[PDB]
Design a protein around this ligand. Structure first.
Ligand SMILES: Nc1ncnc2c1ncn2[C@@H]1O[C@H](COP(=O)(O)OP(=O)(O)OP(=O)(O)O)[C@@H](O)[C@H]1O
Ligand SMILES: [Mg+2]
Length: 532
C-alpha cells in the first residue's frame, strides 16, 4: 500500500501533501517550490517536461506546451466552452472518436487524463523522493461543481499515473478539513469561496463537534467549472491586443509567439495590480513590419483592470445567492468566510465577497495550500491515522430520468448527501410494451429537452401486461467520489435481472491500459410514472 498522499491537481498550480504522523505537510518539489505549475511540454528533442521547466520554454514552443487542461478534462468536443477555447489556445484541440475533447501534439492524439497524469506523476515522484519509498495511493481533488464525466476522467488520470485513487475529494471540502482540524469544540457554519486559475466553487459547510468527534457537513454547493483567473488574463490580453492594434495598426493574434509573450505579461501585470495601483507591460520586439521592429509599452492601472473583469467577479456572486438559498441560510447565519485560491488575492474580489457577507474573510487560511492539506487529511481519515472526523458531502447537480411526455423526473436533487441510493418505481406506457427506455438527465429545467443528456439504455423482456402494471425500479447510485451509476430492473424477473450503466462518456479499459503502459514507457525513458 504505502502512504496515501493528497494531491491538489489545479488548473494552474498543483500541490502535494502527506500526513506526517498526525500533522499534514506540504512537500517541496525538486526545484524547491511548494507548488508546481500544471504545465506539460513536449520538446522537439522528444522529452516531456512538467512544471517550471515546461513553463519557462512556453514562449519558444507554445504549440506543444499544454496548460489549463483541467478546463478540458472530461468535456465533450462540442461543449460551448471547448469550442471557444479551440480558437484561443496555442495547442491543437480535436475531437476524439467518441466525441470527447482531446489534444494533438506532434501528430499524436492525447486524452486529457494522459496529460494530467504527467502532472500527477510529478507530484507522485515528489512524495516518493521525500518519503524514500514508492507511493501507490492518493486522494485527488476536483472542483465541487465538477460533473460526473469530469470526476471520472480525473480518477482515470490518477490510474494512468500509477495511483490508486482512494478518494476524489471536492476542493472546498478539502479546504474545510484543513481549516477545521485546528479549531476546537465550537460549532461553526462556514462559506468557502474558491476562485482559482480555472474554476470557481462556493460551498456552505457546517463543522460540528458531537462529543470529541468533528463532523464536516456540506449543506450546499454551487459554482462554475469554467470561471477563473485564465478568464481574468484573457480580458487583459484582449485589451492589450486592442490597444496595440489601435495605435500601431498590427493585430498580434496572427502571431502565436507574440501571443504567448502577451499572455505571460498580462498575467504578471494582473498580479502586480493586486498590490500596486499601476504597472507597465513592456515587451520589446513584440513584432515587426515594413517600417521596422515594434515594442509594446503600455500602462495598466488597477482601475482599468477592475473595469475589464468586474462582470467576471459579479458572475461569482450569483452562485453565492443560490448556495445560501439551497442551504436555507442568510449571510448572517455564516460564522466564517474563507477565501481559497490565488485569484482571491485581487482586492476587488476580496471587497465584493466581504460586502456580500457583511463580514471580513478569515485570514488564518492558506489560499494556496489548504486544498492539498485537506486532501492529505482525507487520506489520514481513510487509513485511520486521523480519527474522530466524519465527512458528509453532497453531489452538486440534479439528476434523473425522462418519463412520458418529455418530462424530467428527478431521482437525486442537487445537494443530496453522498454516497446516495435513490430508487423509484416506474411502469410501461403502452399495453404489452416489452421494453422501457431509461434516459439519464442532469439539470434543473422542467422539460427533459432543456436538461443535459448523460446516457441511455433499454431494459427489455417485460412480460406483456396492461399499461401501468409492470414494476420497473430505477436506482441512482452515487458513491463517495460523487460518481453515478444508474440501474433498472423488472421487479417480477425470475432471476431479479438488473441492467447497470455508468453515467458518463469516458475512456474504456483498452485505452486506459494502453495509456497506463505508455506511462511506464515514459517512466523508463526518463409504480406510477410512465416510461416510453
Ligand atoms: N496576487 C495575485 N493577484 C491576483 N491573481 C493572482 C495572484 N496570484 C495568483 N493569481 C492567480 O491565481 C490563479 C491560480 O490560483 P490557484 O493556484 O489557486 O489555481 P488552481 O487551484 O491551480 O486552479 P483551480 O482551483 O481553478 O483548478 C492564476 O490565475 C493566477 O494568475
Ligand atoms: Mg484550486
Amino acid at each position: 500500500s504505502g502512504k496515501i498522499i493528497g494531491i491538489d491537481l489545479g488548473t494552474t498550480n498543483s500541490c502535494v501533501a502527506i500526513m506526517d504522523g498526525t500533522t499534514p505537510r506540504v512537500l517541496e518539489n525538486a526545484e524547491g517550490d511548494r507548488t508546481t505549475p500544471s504545465i506539460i511540454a513536449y520538446t522537439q528533442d522528444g522529452e516531456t517536461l512538467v512544471g517550471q521547466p515546461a513553463k519557462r520554454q512556453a514562449v519558444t514552443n507554445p504549440q506543444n506546451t499544454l496548460f489549463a487542461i483541467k478546463r478540458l478534462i472530461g468535456r465533450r468536443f462540442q461543449d460551448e466552452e471547448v469550442q471557444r477555447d479551440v480558437s484561443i489556445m496555442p495547442f491543437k484541440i480535436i475531437a476524439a472518436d467518441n466525441g470527447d475533447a482531446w489534444v494533438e501534439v506532434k501528430g499524436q492524439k492525447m486524452a486529457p487524463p494522459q496529460i494530467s497524469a504527467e502532472v500527477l506523476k510529478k507530484m507522485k515522484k515528489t512524495a516518493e523522493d521525500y518519503l524514500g519509498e514508492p507511493v501507490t495511493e492518493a486522494v485527488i481533488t476536483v472542483p465541487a461543481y465538477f460533473n460526473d464525466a469530469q470526476r471520472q476522467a480525473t480518477k482515470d488520470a490518477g490510474r494512468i499515473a500509477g495511483l490508486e485513487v482512494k478518494r476524489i475529494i471536492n476542493e472546498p471540502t478539502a479546504a474545510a478539513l484543513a481549516y477545521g482540524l485546528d479549531k476546537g469544540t465550537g460549532n461553526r457554519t462556514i462559506a468557502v469561496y474558491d476562485l482559482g486559475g480555472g474554476a470557481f466553487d462556493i460551498s456552505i459547510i457546517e463543522i460540528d463537534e458531537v462529543d470529541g468527534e468533528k463532523t464536516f457537513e456540506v449543506l450546499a454547493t454551487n459554482g462554475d467549472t469554467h470561471l477563473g483567473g485564465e478568464d481574468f488574463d484573457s480580458r487583459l490580453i484582449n485589451y492589450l491586443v486592442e490597444e496595440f492594434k489601435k495605435d500601431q495598426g498590427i493585430d498580434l493574434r496572427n502571431d502565436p509567439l507574440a501571443m504567448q509573450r502577451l499572455k505571460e505579461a498580462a498575467e504578471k501585470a494582473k498580479i502586480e495590480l493586486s498590490s500596486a495601483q499601476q504597472t507597465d507591460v513592456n515587451l520589446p520586439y513584440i513584432t515587426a513590419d515594413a517600417t521596422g521592429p515594434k515594442h509594446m509599452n503600455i500602462k495598466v492601472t488597477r482601475a482599468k483592470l477592475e473595469s475589464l473583469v468586474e462582470d467576471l467577479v459579479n458572475r461569482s456572486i450569483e452562485p453565492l445567492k443560490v448556495a445560501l438559498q439551497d442551504a436555507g441560510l442568510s449571510v448572517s447565519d455564516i460564522d466564517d468566510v474563507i477565501l481559497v485560491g490565488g485569484q482571491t488575492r485581487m482586492p476587488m474580489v476580496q471587497k465584493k465577497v466581504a460586502e456580500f457577507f457583511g463580514k471580513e474573510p478569515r485570514k488564518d487560511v492558506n489560499p494556496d495550500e489548504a486544498v492539498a492539506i485537506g486532501a492529505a487529511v482525507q487520506g489520514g481519515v481513510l487509513t485511520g491515522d486521523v480519527k474522530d472526523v466524519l465527512l458528509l458531502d453532497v453531489t452538486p447537480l440534479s439528476l434523473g430520468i425522462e418519463t412520458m411526455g418529455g418530462v424530467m423526473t428527478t431521482l437525486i436533487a442537487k445537494n443530496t448527501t453522498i454516497p446516495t441510493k435513490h430508487s423509484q418505481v416506474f411502469s410501461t406506457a403502452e399495453d404489452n410494451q416489452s421494453a422501457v427506455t431509461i434516459h439519464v438527465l442532469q439539470g434543473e429545467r422542467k422539460r427533459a429537452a432543456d436538461n443535459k443528456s448523460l446516457g441511455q439504455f433499454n431494459l427489455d423482456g417485460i412480460n406483456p401486461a396492461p399499461r401501468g402494471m409492470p414494476q420497473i425500479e430505477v436506482t441512482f447510485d452515487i458513491d463517495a467520489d460523487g460518481i453515478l451509476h444508474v440501474s433498472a430492473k423488472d421487479k417480477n424477473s425470475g432471476k431479479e435481472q438488473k441492467i447497470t450503466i455508468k453515467a458518463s462518456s469516458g475512456l474504456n479499459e483498452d485505452e486506459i491500459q494502453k495509456m497506463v503502459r505508455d506511462a511506464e514507457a515514459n517512466a523508463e525513458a526518463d409504480g406510477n410514472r410512465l416510461l416510453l
